[PDB]
Amino acid sequence: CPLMVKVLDAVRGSPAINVAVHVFGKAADDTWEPFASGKTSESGELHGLTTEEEFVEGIYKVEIDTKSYWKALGISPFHEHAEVVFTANDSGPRRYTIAALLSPYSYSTMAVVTNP
Amino acid sequence: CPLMVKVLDAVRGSPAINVAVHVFGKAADDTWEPFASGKTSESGELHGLTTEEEFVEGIYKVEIDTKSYWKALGISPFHEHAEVVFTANDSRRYTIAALLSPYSYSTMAVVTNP
Amino acid sequence: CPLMVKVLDAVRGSPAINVAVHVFGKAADDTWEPFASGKTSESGELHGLTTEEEFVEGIYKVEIDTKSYWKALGISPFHEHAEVVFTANDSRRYTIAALLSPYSYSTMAVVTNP
Amino acid sequence: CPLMVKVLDAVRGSPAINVAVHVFGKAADDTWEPFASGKTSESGELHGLTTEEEFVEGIYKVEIDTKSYWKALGISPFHEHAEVVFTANDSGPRRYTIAALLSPYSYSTMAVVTNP
């Protein structure tokens, strides 16, 4: 698991379950192209998005669908989504955990990067 | 104004108004003793807590009474209060900000120079 | 002033000065097009981006060029930039704040009323 | 594990390793008394602090020694420590994960509370 995404809900003190996540790579002509997608589990975690072989070096965007999450809970939030844009694997393969802590009008995001 | 406290509400996207804030200095016997207090204004800010003369070097605690803020809004919160503990050092204006959610808070210190 | 951006540095405890900020509106073909831009001031603030007349309802993106800020400080950062995407809605002043660290950021929106 | 503490370093993008943590309970006369202590592992996590039987209902304070953490890395930080004060187990036993994301002049803390 070279890429994992973890999402937490700061209103409820719980994993944020069933949150849609779309990952994009920047292509040769500098457009975003779809790379992987999935939804968080009951643990708030999304594993299995990619493999070490497919996750080549480049710029990636992880878009977390926070607006649909909040609306289904009765809340009209500020953000359309949370976006995390970063260069990956440019010094060789790494493992990335992208965490997001969500509130209706704010979010915090953190990455942990490790070398296996 | 050596010390200012700013509190924001991440559920409503607004200042956190009428939040009680207590500041304590840490004394000889090493116990906390009240130093200054107030309630945040409509802008979520609390000015006028202390003076340059009084705010000497030492360890201070700022307690923000977040539980009462959430209770008044009908929202079950996790923490009893948020606590910010730090040493003042002469080299300054301290702005202590806190962003509140029911099960999380973020706090930041901006230290700036005259 | 319908829109203000404030950027703070959690490594130094200071405003984040001279940070480039780009705002985009999201147009017909659904592409992002430049709307306003500027650099944060010595207080970490960027005022004057748009007007009430121009800031109509719609989806906007604020991109804060955090990578260049950290590079100028000699600190290896994680993100290319921080992005804040939201819909403006008539019912208002928007303050978008971002607290920066090299591998994390927090962002908050304060929406207030005249 | 009714109580776990996880600490992350936002300067380095890594677990915060070997961070001292002291937990206190509020006693009958309303003084803080020592309840448990430990240090974070290489994963940034501190497990084994207490048992369901010992972790009775009450007010607890988790003090994370962030100042010593930063100083050993060459950084003179703002806070003496990060403090997390909460009532626990007052509606029956729960499991608490207390997370803290650390920077030199800021921290964020989040709790996830689950019912086993």
CSV table of C-alpha atoms in Angstrom, one decimal:
chain,number,residue,atom,x,y,z
A,1,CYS,CA,0.0,0.0,0.0
A,2,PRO,CA,2.0,2.9,-1.3
A,3,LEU,CA,-1.0,5.2,-1.0
A,4,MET,CA,-3.5,5.3,1.8
A,5,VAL,CA,-6.1,7.9,2.8
A,6,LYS,CA,-7.6,8.3,6.2
A,7,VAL,CA,-10.5,10.7,7.0
A,8,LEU,CA,-11.8,11.6,10.4
A,9,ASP,CA,-14.9,13.6,11.5
A,10,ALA,CA,-14.2,16.2,14.2
A,11,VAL,CA,-17.9,16.9,14.9
A,12,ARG,CA,-18.7,13.4,15.9
A,13,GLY,CA,-15.3,12.1,17.1
A,14,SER,CA,-15.3,9.2,14.7
A,15,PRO,CA,-13.9,7.9,11.4
A,16,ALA,CA,-15.5,9.5,8.4
A,17,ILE,CA,-17.1,6.5,6.7
A,18,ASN,CA,-18.1,6.2,3.0
A,19,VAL,CA,-16.2,9.4,1.9
A,20,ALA,CA,-15.5,9.4,-1.8
A,21,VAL,CA,-11.9,9.9,-2.8
A,22,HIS,CA,-10.6,10.6,-6.4
A,23,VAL,CA,-6.9,10.6,-7.2
A,24,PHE,CA,-5.6,12.2,-10.4
A,25,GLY,CA,-2.1,12.3,-12.0
A,26,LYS,CA,-0.7,15.2,-14.0
A,27,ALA,CA,-0.3,14.0,-17.6
A,28,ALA,CA,2.4,14.9,-20.2
A,29,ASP,CA,0.4,17.9,-21.4
A,30,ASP,CA,-0.2,19.0,-17.8
A,31,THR,CA,-3.9,18.1,-17.6
A,32,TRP,CA,-5.2,16.1,-14.7
A,33,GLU,CA,-6.2,12.6,-15.5
A,34,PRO,CA,-8.0,10.0,-13.4
A,35,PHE,CA,-5.6,7.7,-11.6
A,36,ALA,CA,-7.7,5.8,-8.9
A,37,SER,CA,-10.8,6.2,-6.8
A,38,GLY,CA,-12.5,4.6,-3.8
A,39,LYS,CA,-14.4,5.3,-0.6
A,40,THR,CA,-13.4,5.2,3.0
A,41,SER,CA,-14.3,2.1,5.1
A,42,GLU,CA,-15.9,2.0,8.5
A,43,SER,CA,-12.4,2.7,9.9
A,44,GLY,CA,-12.2,6.0,7.8
A,45,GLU,CA,-9.5,4.4,5.7
A,46,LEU,CA,-9.1,3.8,2.0
A,47,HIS,CA,-6.5,1.2,1.1
A,48,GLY,CA,-5.8,-0.5,-2.3
A,49,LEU,CA,-5.9,2.5,-4.5
A,50,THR,CA,-2.6,1.7,-6.3
A,51,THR,CA,0.5,-0.6,-6.5
A,52,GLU,CA,4.2,0.4,-6.2
A,53,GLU,CA,4.5,-0.5,-10.0
A,54,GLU,CA,1.7,1.8,-11.1
A,55,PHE,CA,2.4,4.7,-8.8
A,56,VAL,CA,5.2,6.2,-10.8
A,57,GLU,CA,6.9,9.5,-10.1
A,58,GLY,CA,4.7,12.6,-10.8
A,59,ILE,CA,2.4,15.2,-9.4
A,60,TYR,CA,-0.8,13.8,-7.9
A,61,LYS,CA,-4.0,15.3,-6.6
A,62,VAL,CA,-6.1,13.5,-4.0
A,63,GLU,CA,-9.7,15.0,-3.9
A,64,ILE,CA,-11.7,14.1,-0.9
A,65,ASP,CA,-15.5,14.6,-1.4
A,66,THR,CA,-16.2,16.3,1.9
A,67,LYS,CA,-19.2,18.3,0.7
A,68,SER,CA,-21.3,15.1,0.0
A,69,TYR,CA,-20.2,13.7,3.3
A,70,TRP,CA,-21.5,16.6,5.3
A,71,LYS,CA,-24.7,17.1,3.4
A,72,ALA,CA,-25.8,13.5,4.1
A,73,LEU,CA,-25.3,14.2,7.8
A,74,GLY,CA,-27.6,17.3,7.5
A,75,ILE,CA,-24.8,19.9,7.4
A,76,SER,CA,-24.2,22.4,4.6
A,77,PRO,CA,-20.4,22.8,4.7
A,78,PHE,CA,-18.1,25.5,3.3
A,79,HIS,CA,-15.8,23.5,1.1
A,80,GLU,CA,-16.6,21.6,-2.2
A,81,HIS,CA,-14.0,19.1,-1.2
A,82,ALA,CA,-10.5,18.8,0.3
A,83,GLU,CA,-7.6,18.8,-2.1
A,84,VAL,CA,-4.1,17.5,-1.5
A,85,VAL,CA,-1.6,18.1,-4.3
A,86,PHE,CA,1.9,16.7,-4.1
A,87,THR,CA,4.8,15.3,-5.9
A,88,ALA,CA,5.3,11.6,-5.2
A,89,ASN,CA,8.2,9.1,-5.7
A,90,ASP,CA,10.7,11.5,-7.1
A,91,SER,CA,13.5,10.2,-5.0
A,92,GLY,CA,12.4,6.6,-5.4
A,93,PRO,CA,9.3,4.8,-4.1
A,94,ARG,CA,7.8,6.0,-0.8
A,95,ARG,CA,4.7,5.1,1.2
A,96,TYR,CA,2.2,7.9,1.7
A,97,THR,CA,-0.5,8.3,4.3
A,98,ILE,CA,-2.7,11.3,3.6
A,99,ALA,CA,-4.9,12.1,6.6
A,100,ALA,CA,-7.7,14.7,6.7
A,101,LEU,CA,-9.6,15.9,9.8
A,102,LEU,CA,-12.9,17.4,8.8
A,103,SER,CA,-15.2,20.1,10.2
A,104,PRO,CA,-18.0,21.9,8.4
A,105,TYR,CA,-16.0,25.1,8.0
A,106,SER,CA,-12.4,23.8,8.3
A,107,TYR,CA,-10.1,20.9,7.6
A,108,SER,CA,-6.6,19.9,8.4
A,109,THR,CA,-4.6,17.6,6.3
A,110,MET,CA,-1.3,15.9,7.1
A,111,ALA,CA,1.0,13.5,5.2
A,112,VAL,CA,3.3,10.9,6.6
A,113,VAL,CA,5.9,9.7,4.1
A,114,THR,CA,8.0,6.6,4.9
A,115,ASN,CA,10.7,4.7,3.0
A,116,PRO,CA,10.0,0.9,3.2
B,1,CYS,CA,-1.2,44.8,24.1
B,2,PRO,CA,1.2,42.0,24.9
B,3,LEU,CA,-1.3,39.2,24.8
B,4,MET,CA,-4.5,38.7,22.7
B,5,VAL,CA,-6.6,35.5,22.4
B,6,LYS,CA,-8.8,34.8,19.3
B,7,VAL,CA,-11.3,31.9,19.2
B,8,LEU,CA,-13.1,30.6,16.1
B,9,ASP,CA,-15.9,28.1,15.6
B,10,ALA,CA,-15.3,25.5,12.8
B,11,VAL,CA,-18.8,24.2,12.9
B,12,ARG,CA,-20.5,27.5,12.1
B,13,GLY,CA,-17.6,29.3,10.4
B,14,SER,CA,-17.8,32.2,12.8
B,15,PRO,CA,-16.0,33.8,15.6
B,16,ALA,CA,-16.6,32.1,18.9
B,17,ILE,CA,-18.4,34.7,20.9
B,18,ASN,CA,-18.7,35.0,24.7
B,19,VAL,CA,-16.2,32.3,25.4
B,20,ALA,CA,-14.7,32.5,28.8
B,21,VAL,CA,-10.9,32.7,28.8
B,22,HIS,CA,-8.7,32.4,32.0
B,23,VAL,CA,-5.0,33.1,32.2
B,24,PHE,CA,-2.9,31.8,35.0
B,25,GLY,CA,0.7,32.5,36.0
B,26,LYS,CA,2.7,29.8,37.5
B,27,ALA,CA,3.9,30.8,41.0
B,28,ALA,CA,6.6,30.0,43.6
B,29,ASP,CA,5.1,26.8,45.1
B,30,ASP,CA,4.6,26.0,41.4
B,31,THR,CA,0.8,26.2,41.5
B,32,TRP,CA,-1.3,28.1,38.9
B,33,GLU,CA,-2.8,31.3,40.1
B,34,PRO,CA,-5.3,33.5,38.3
B,35,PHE,CA,-3.6,36.3,36.3
B,36,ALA,CA,-6.3,37.7,34.0
B,37,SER,CA,-9.6,36.7,32.4
B,38,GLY,CA,-12.4,37.8,30.1
B,39,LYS,CA,-14.9,36.7,27.5
B,40,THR,CA,-14.4,36.8,23.8
B,41,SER,CA,-16.1,39.7,21.9
B,42,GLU,CA,-18.3,39.4,18.8
B,43,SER,CA,-15.2,39.2,16.7
B,44,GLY,CA,-14.0,36.2,18.8
B,45,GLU,CA,-11.2,38.3,20.2
B,46,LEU,CA,-10.2,39.1,23.7
B,47,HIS,CA,-8.0,42.2,24.2
B,48,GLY,CA,-6.8,44.0,27.3
B,49,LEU,CA,-5.8,41.0,29.4
B,50,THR,CA,-2.5,42.3,30.6
B,51,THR,CA,0.1,45.1,30.2
B,52,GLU,CA,3.8,45.1,29.2
B,53,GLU,CA,4.7,46.0,32.8
B,54,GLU,CA,2.8,43.0,34.2
B,55,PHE,CA,3.5,40.4,31.6
B,56,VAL,CA,7.0,39.4,32.8
B,57,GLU,CA,9.0,36.4,31.6
B,58,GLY,CA,7.5,33.2,33.1
B,59,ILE,CA,5.3,30.3,32.4
B,60,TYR,CA,1.6,31.0,31.6
B,61,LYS,CA,-1.5,29.0,31.0
B,62,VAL,CA,-4.4,30.1,28.9
B,63,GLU,CA,-7.6,28.0,29.5
B,64,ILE,CA,-10.4,28.5,27.0
B,65,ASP,CA,-13.8,27.2,28.3
B,66,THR,CA,-14.9,25.4,25.2
B,67,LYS,CA,-17.2,22.9,27.0
B,68,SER,CA,-19.6,25.7,28.0
B,69,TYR,CA,-19.5,27.2,24.5
B,70,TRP,CA,-20.6,23.9,22.9
B,71,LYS,CA,-23.2,23.1,25.6
B,72,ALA,CA,-24.9,26.5,25.0
B,73,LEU,CA,-25.1,25.5,21.3
B,74,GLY,CA,-26.6,22.1,22.1
B,75,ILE,CA,-23.6,20.2,20.8
B,76,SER,CA,-21.9,17.5,22.8
B,77,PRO,CA,-18.2,18.2,23.1
B,78,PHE,CA,-15.2,16.1,23.9
B,79,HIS,CA,-12.9,18.4,25.9
B,80,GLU,CA,-13.4,20.1,29.3
B,81,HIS,CA,-11.5,23.1,28.0
B,82,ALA,CA,-8.6,23.9,25.7
B,83,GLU,CA,-5.3,24.7,27.3
B,84,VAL,CA,-2.3,26.6,25.9
B,85,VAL,CA,0.8,26.6,28.1
B,86,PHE,CA,3.9,28.6,27.2
B,87,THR,CA,6.9,30.6,28.4
B,88,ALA,CA,7.0,34.3,27.8
B,89,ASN,CA,10.5,35.4,26.7
B,90,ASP,CA,11.9,38.9,26.3
B,91,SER,CA,13.8,39.4,23.1
B,92,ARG,CA,7.0,41.0,21.5
B,93,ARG,CA,3.3,40.5,21.1
B,94,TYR,CA,1.6,37.1,21.5
B,95,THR,CA,-1.6,36.2,19.7
B,96,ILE,CA,-3.0,32.9,20.7
B,97,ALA,CA,-5.6,31.5,18.3
B,98,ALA,CA,-7.8,28.5,18.8
B,99,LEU,CA,-10.0,26.9,16.2
B,100,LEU,CA,-12.7,24.8,17.8
B,101,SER,CA,-14.7,21.7,16.8
B,102,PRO,CA,-16.6,19.4,19.1
B,103,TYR,CA,-14.0,16.6,19.1
B,104,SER,CA,-10.9,18.6,18.0
B,105,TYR,CA,-9.1,21.9,18.3
B,106,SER,CA,-6.2,23.5,16.7
B,107,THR,CA,-4.2,26.2,18.4
B,108,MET,CA,-1.5,28.5,16.9
B,109,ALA,CA,0.7,31.2,18.4
B,110,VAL,CA,1.8,34.2,16.4
B,111,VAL,CA,4.7,36.0,18.0
B,112,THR,CA,5.4,39.4,16.5
B,113,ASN,CA,7.8,42.3,17.0
B,114,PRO,CA,7.6,46.1,17.6
C,1,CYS,CA,-14.1,43.6,1.0
C,2,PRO,CA,-15.9,40.4,0.2
C,3,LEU,CA,-12.9,38.1,0.2
C,4,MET,CA,-9.7,38.2,2.4
C,5,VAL,CA,-7.0,35.5,2.6
C,6,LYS,CA,-4.7,35.2,5.7
C,7,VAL,CA,-1.7,32.8,5.8
C,8,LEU,CA,0.3,31.9,8.9
C,9,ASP,CA,3.6,29.9,9.4
C,10,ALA,CA,3.4,27.3,12.2
C,11,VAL,CA,7.2,26.7,12.1
C,12,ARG,CA,8.2,30.3,12.9
C,13,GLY,CA,5.0,31.4,14.6
C,14,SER,CA,4.6,34.3,12.2
C,15,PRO,CA,2.6,35.6,9.4
C,16,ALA,CA,3.5,34.1,6.1
C,17,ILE,CA,4.8,37.0,4.2
C,18,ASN,CA,5.0,37.4,0.4
C,19,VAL,CA,3.1,34.2,-0.4
C,20,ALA,CA,1.5,34.2,-3.8
C,21,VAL,CA,-2.3,33.6,-3.8
C,22,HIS,CA,-4.3,32.9,-7.0
C,23,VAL,CA,-8.1,32.9,-7.2
C,24,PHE,CA,-10.0,31.2,-10.0
C,25,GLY,CA,-13.6,31.2,-11.0
C,26,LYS,CA,-15.1,28.2,-12.5
C,27,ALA,CA,-16.4,29.0,-16.0
C,28,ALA,CA,-18.9,27.7,-18.6
C,29,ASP,CA,-16.8,24.9,-20.1
C,30,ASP,CA,-16.2,24.1,-16.4
C,31,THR,CA,-12.5,25.1,-16.5
C,32,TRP,CA,-10.8,27.3,-13.9
C,33,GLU,CA,-10.0,30.7,-15.1
C,34,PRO,CA,-7.9,33.4,-13.3
C,35,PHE,CA,-10.1,35.8,-11.3
C,36,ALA,CA,-7.7,37.7,-8.9
C,37,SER,CA,-4.3,37.3,-7.4
C,38,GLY,CA,-1.8,38.9,-5.1
C,39,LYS,CA,0.9,38.3,-2.5
C,40,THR,CA,0.4,38.3,1.3
C,41,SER,CA,1.5,41.4,3.1
C,42,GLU,CA,3.8,41.6,6.2
C,43,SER,CA,0.7,40.7,8.3
C,44,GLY,CA,0.1,37.6,6.2
C,45,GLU,CA,-3.0,39.2,4.8
C,46,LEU,CA,-4.2,39.7,1.3
C,47,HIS,CA,-6.9,42.3,0.9
C,48,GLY,CA,-8.4,43.9,-2.2
C,49,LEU,CA,-8.8,40.8,-4.4
C,50,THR,CA,-12.3,41.5,-5.6
C,51,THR,CA,-15.4,43.7,-5.2
C,52,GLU,CA,-19.0,43.0,-4.2
C,53,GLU,CA,-20.1,43.7,-7.7
C,54,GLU,CA,-17.7,41.1,-9.2
C,55,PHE,CA,-17.9,38.4,-6.6
C,56,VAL,CA,-21.1,36.8,-7.7
C,57,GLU,CA,-22.4,33.5,-6.6
C,58,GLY,CA,-20.4,30.6,-8.1
C,59,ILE,CA,-17.6,28.2,-7.4
C,60,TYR,CA,-14.2,29.6,-6.6
C,61,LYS,CA,-10.8,28.2,-6.0
C,62,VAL,CA,-8.1,29.8,-3.9
C,63,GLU,CA,-4.6,28.4,-4.5
C,64,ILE,CA,-1.9,29.3,-2.0
C,65,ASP,CA,1.7,28.8,-3.3
C,66,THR,CA,3.1,27.1,-0.3
C,67,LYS,CA,5.8,25.2,-2.0
C,68,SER,CA,7.7,28.4,-3.0
C,69,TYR,CA,7.3,29.8,0.5
C,70,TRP,CA,9.0,26.8,2.1
C,71,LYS,CA,11.6,26.5,-0.6
C,72,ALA,CA,12.7,30.2,0.0
C,73,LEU,CA,13.1,29.2,3.7
C,74,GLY,CA,15.2,26.1,2.9
C,75,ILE,CA,12.6,23.7,4.2
C,76,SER,CA,11.5,20.7,2.2
C,77,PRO,CA,7.7,20.8,1.9
C,78,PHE,CA,5.1,18.1,1.0
C,79,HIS,CA,2.4,19.9,-1.0
C,80,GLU,CA,2.6,21.7,-4.3
C,81,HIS,CA,0.2,24.3,-3.0
C,82,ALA,CA,-2.8,24.5,-0.7
C,83,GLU,CA,-6.2,24.7,-2.4
C,84,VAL,CA,-9.5,26.0,-1.0
C,85,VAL,CA,-12.6,25.4,-3.1
C,86,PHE,CA,-16.0,26.7,-2.2
C,87,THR,CA,-19.3,28.2,-3.5
C,88,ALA,CA,-20.1,31.8,-2.8
C,89,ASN,CA,-23.7,32.2,-1.7
C,90,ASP,CA,-25.8,35.3,-1.3
C,91,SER,CA,-27.8,35.5,2.0
C,92,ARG,CA,-21.4,38.4,3.5
C,93,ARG,CA,-17.6,38.6,4.0
C,94,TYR,CA,-15.4,35.5,3.5
C,95,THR,CA,-12.0,35.2,5.3
C,96,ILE,CA,-10.0,32.2,4.3
C,97,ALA,CA,-7.2,31.4,6.7
C,98,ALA,CA,-4.5,28.8,6.2
C,99,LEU,CA,-2.0,27.7,8.8
C,100,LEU,CA,1.1,26.2,7.2
C,101,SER,CA,3.6,23.5,8.2
C,102,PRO,CA,5.9,21.6,5.8
C,103,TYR,CA,3.8,18.4,5.8
C,104,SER,CA,0.5,19.7,7.0
C,105,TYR,CA,-1.9,22.6,6.7
C,106,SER,CA,-5.1,23.6,8.3
C,107,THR,CA,-7.6,25.9,6.6
C,108,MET,CA,-10.6,27.7,8.0
C,109,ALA,CA,-13.4,29.9,6.6
C,110,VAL,CA,-14.9,32.6,8.6
C,111,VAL,CA,-18.1,33.8,7.0
C,112,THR,CA,-19.5,37.0,8.6
C,113,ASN,CA,-22.4,39.4,8.1
C,114,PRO,CA,-23.0,43.2,7.5
D,1,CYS,CA,-6.7,-0.7,24.9
D,2,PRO,CA,-9.2,1.8,26.2
D,3,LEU,CA,-6.7,4.6,25.9
D,4,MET,CA,-4.2,5.2,23.0
D,5,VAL,CA,-2.2,8.3,22.1
D,6,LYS,CA,-0.9,8.9,18.7
D,7,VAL,CA,1.5,11.8,17.9
D,8,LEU,CA,2.7,13.0,14.5
D,9,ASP,CA,5.3,15.5,13.4
D,10,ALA,CA,4.1,18.0,10.8
D,11,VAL,CA,7.6,19.4,10.1
D,12,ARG,CA,9.1,16.1,9.1
D,13,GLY,CA,6.0,14.2,7.8
D,14,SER,CA,6.6,11.3,10.2
D,15,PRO,CA,5.4,9.7,13.5
D,16,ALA,CA,6.7,11.7,16.5
D,17,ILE,CA,8.9,9.0,18.2
D,18,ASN,CA,9.9,8.8,21.9
D,19,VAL,CA,7.5,11.6,23.0
D,20,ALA,CA,6.8,11.4,26.7
D,21,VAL,CA,3.1,11.3,27.8
D,22,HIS,CA,1.7,11.7,31.3
D,23,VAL,CA,-1.9,11.0,32.1
D,24,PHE,CA,-3.6,12.3,35.3
D,25,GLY,CA,-7.0,11.7,36.9
D,26,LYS,CA,-8.9,14.3,38.9
D,27,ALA,CA,-9.1,13.0,42.5
D,28,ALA,CA,-11.9,13.4,45.1
D,29,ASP,CA,-10.5,16.7,46.4
D,30,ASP,CA,-10.1,17.9,42.8
D,31,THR,CA,-6.3,17.7,42.5
D,32,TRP,CA,-4.6,16.0,39.6
D,33,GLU,CA,-3.0,12.8,40.5
D,34,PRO,CA,-0.7,10.6,38.3
D,35,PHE,CA,-2.6,7.9,36.5
D,36,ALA,CA,-0.3,6.5,33.8
D,37,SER,CA,2.7,7.4,31.7
D,38,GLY,CA,4.7,6.2,28.7
D,39,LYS,CA,6.4,7.2,25.5
D,40,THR,CA,5.5,6.9,21.9
D,41,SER,CA,6.9,4.1,19.8
D,42,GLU,CA,8.5,4.3,16.3
D,43,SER,CA,4.9,4.4,15.0
D,44,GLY,CA,4.2,7.5,17.1
D,45,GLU,CA,1.8,5.4,19.1
D,46,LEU,CA,1.5,4.8,22.8
D,47,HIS,CA,-0.5,1.7,23.8
D,48,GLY,CA,-0.9,-0.1,27.1
D,49,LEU,CA,-1.4,2.9,29.3
D,50,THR,CA,-4.4,1.4,31.2
D,51,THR,CA,-7.1,-1.4,31.3
D,52,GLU,CA,-10.9,-1.2,31.1
D,53,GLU,CA,-11.1,-2.1,34.8
D,54,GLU,CA,-8.7,0.7,36.0
D,55,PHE,CA,-10.0,3.4,33.6
D,56,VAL,CA,-13.0,4.3,35.7
D,57,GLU,CA,-15.2,7.3,35.0
D,58,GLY,CA,-13.7,10.7,35.7
D,59,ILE,CA,-11.9,13.7,34.3
D,60,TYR,CA,-8.5,12.9,32.8
D,61,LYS,CA,-5.7,15.0,31.5
D,62,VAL,CA,-3.2,13.7,28.9
D,63,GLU,CA,-0.1,15.9,28.9
D,64,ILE,CA,2.1,15.4,25.8
D,65,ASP,CA,5.7,16.6,26.3
D,66,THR,CA,6.1,18.4,23.1
D,67,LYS,CA,8.7,20.9,24.2
D,68,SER,CA,11.3,18.2,24.9
D,69,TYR,CA,10.5,16.6,21.6
D,70,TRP,CA,11.3,19.7,19.6
D,71,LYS,CA,14.3,20.8,21.6
D,72,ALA,CA,16.0,17.5,20.9
D,73,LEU,CA,15.5,18.2,17.1
D,74,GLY,CA,17.1,21.6,17.4
D,75,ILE,CA,13.9,23.6,17.6
D,76,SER,CA,12.8,26.0,20.3
D,77,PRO,CA,9.0,25.6,20.2
D,78,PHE,CA,6.2,27.8,21.6
D,79,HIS,CA,4.3,25.4,23.9
D,80,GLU,CA,5.5,23.7,27.1
D,81,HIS,CA,3.4,20.7,26.2
D,82,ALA,CA,0.0,19.8,24.6
D,83,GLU,CA,-2.8,19.2,27.1
D,84,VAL,CA,-5.9,17.2,26.4
D,85,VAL,CA,-8.5,17.3,29.2
D,86,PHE,CA,-11.8,15.3,29.0
D,87,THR,CA,-14.4,13.4,30.9
D,88,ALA,CA,-14.1,9.7,30.1
D,89,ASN,CA,-16.5,6.6,30.6
D,90,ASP,CA,-19.4,8.6,32.0
D,91,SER,CA,-21.9,6.7,29.9
D,92,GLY,CA,-20.1,3.4,30.3
D,93,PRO,CA,-16.7,2.2,29.0
D,94,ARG,CA,-15.5,3.7,25.7
D,95,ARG,CA,-12.3,3.4,23.7
D,96,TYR,CA,-10.4,6.7,23.2
D,97,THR,CA,-7.7,7.5,20.6
D,98,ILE,CA,-6.2,10.9,21.3
D,99,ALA,CA,-4.2,12.2,18.3
D,100,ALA,CA,-1.9,15.2,18.2
D,101,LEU,CA,-0.3,16.8,15.2
D,102,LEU,CA,2.6,18.9,16.2
D,103,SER,CA,4.4,22.0,14.7
D,104,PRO,CA,6.8,24.3,16.6
D,105,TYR,CA,4.2,27.0,17.0
D,106,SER,CA,0.9,25.1,16.7
D,107,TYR,CA,-0.8,21.8,17.4
D,108,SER,CA,-4.0,20.2,16.5
D,109,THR,CA,-5.6,17.5,18.6
D,110,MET,CA,-8.4,15.1,17.8
D,111,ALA,CA,-10.2,12.4,19.7
D,112,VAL,CA,-12.0,9.4,18.3
D,113,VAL,CA,-14.3,7.7,20.8
D,114,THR,CA,-15.8,4.3,20.0
D,115,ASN,CA,-18.1,1.9,21.8
D,116,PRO,CA,-16.7,-1.7,21.7
